[PDB]
Structures are given as structure tokens and as C-alpha cells.
Automatic annotation (TrEMBL), chain B:
The chain holds residues 665 to 736 of 1373 of the full protein. It is found in: Plastid, Chloroplast. It comes from the Eukaryota. In plastids the minimal PEP RNA polymerase catalytic core is composed of four subunits: alpha, beta, beta', and beta''. When a (nuclear-encoded) sigma factor is associated with the core the holoenzyme is formed, which can initiate transcription. DNA-dependent RNA polymerase catalyzes the transcription of DNA into RNA using the four ribonucleoside triphosphates as substrates. The gene is rpoC2. This is DNA-directed RNA polymerase subunit beta''. Belongs to the RNA polymerase beta' chain family. RpoC2 subfamily.
């Protein structure tokens, strides 16, 4: 019997997405590499991360690297600066907060 | 002329022990592993269940994700 992961929680996704967007705005503004495209990059960052949490994330063990791979590609496809750097910042925040916050939200150890 | 020491935290536990950490989960420092055991270091959690014992390992380090061109 293949294990069935818990279904994504839209309410948790909305809360995490706001925290993710605020961190990205503060982090990416401190770097001169992004210049005037900070808002556009963060907006693209927010959209992909929110979609992954709404549809695929089901707790610990489901934090995939594919949305972060899509982060570097989408910025590069749009000719936006700091593609890999923005994806690296996003994946670092997710590794430190997403799994822990899901446990607090659901009360699971 | 050089010797190496990778740090890994390993817990050998009886099969009947109650494990409060999921496989492939990321835990921080002082994360409770069993009712009387707390993690000393943080990292990835790997749970291997054997015939009569449960082997739990905590791997420190940075988690990286492969690229399409990543020839690892």
C-alpha cells in the first residue's frame, strides 16, 4: 500500500505564502543585483511557491525542489537578473520554515 | 597526512520504541526523538527498521536539489 500524504491545506498555504513573500522582499532588496526588478521577481517568486503549497505540499517529506528549479528557469526565461540567487534564497527559507510551520499548524510531531 | 571525521548522530532503538520523528524529516537541535531521547544535532532524519531493532540516523549538512544538466 503506497503511503497517502495528507492533502494540502489552502489556509496554511495562504499563511506561509505571505511569510515567504515578506522574507523575499526584505532579502532581495538588500542585494544590488536585482536593482529595479525586486518587485517583479518577488511577485514571480510568490506565485510559483503559492501554487506548489496549494496543490502538492502535504507536510514533511513533500517539500520538493522542482518549484525552486522552476524559480530559476522562469526568471531566466523572462530575462530577469538574479535568477539562481533568488531561487537559492527561496529554497533556503523553505528548508528552515516550511516543514516546521506545518507541524505547528497541524500539531503533528 | 590527513584524516577525516564526518559527524553523524545514530540511535539504535528497540523495535517497540515509539518514534516521534518521520522518515526524511528535517529536525532542529533539541528535537525529541523518543520519550526520553532528544536530538543533539540537527539535520535529516533517516529511520531504518530491522528485524528486532530500529536504526535512526541524523545527518548534518546542506540539502541541495539536482538540475536538469546536473551530471551528479
Amino acid at each position: 500500500a503506497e503511503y497517502k500524504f495528507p492533502d494540502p491545506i489552502p489556509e496554511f498555504a495562504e499563511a506561509e505564502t505571505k511569510k515567504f513573500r515578506d522574507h523575499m522582499a526584505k532579502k532581495l532588496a538588500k542585494r544590488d543585483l536585482f536593482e529595479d526588478s525586486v518587485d517583479e521577481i518577488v511577485g514571480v517568486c510568490t506565485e510559483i511557491f503559492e501554487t506548489f503549497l496549494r496543490n502538492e505540499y502535504g507536510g514533511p517529506g513533500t517539500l520538493l525542489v522542482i518549484p525552486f528549479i522552476d524559480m530559476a528557469d522562469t526568471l531566466n526565461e523572462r530575462e530577469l537578473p538574479g535568477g539562481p540567487q533568488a531561487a537559492r534564497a527561496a529554497i533556503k527559507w523553505a528548508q528552515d520554515h516550511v516543514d516546521k510551520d506545518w507541524k505547528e499548524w497541524t500539531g503533528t510531531d | 597526512d590527513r584524516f577525516f571525521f564526518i559527524p553523524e548522530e545514530v540511535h539504535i532503538l528497540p523495535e517497540s520504541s515509539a518514534i516521534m520523528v518521520e522518515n526524511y524529516s528535517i529536525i532542529g537541535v533539541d528535537t525529541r526523538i523518543t520519550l526520553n531521547i532528544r536530538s543533539q544535532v540537527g539535520g535529516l532524519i533517516r529511520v531504518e527498521r530491522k528485524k528486532k531493532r530500529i536504526e535512526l540516523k541524523i545527518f548534518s549538512g546542506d540539502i541541495h536539489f539536482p538540475d536538469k544538466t546536473d551530471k551528479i
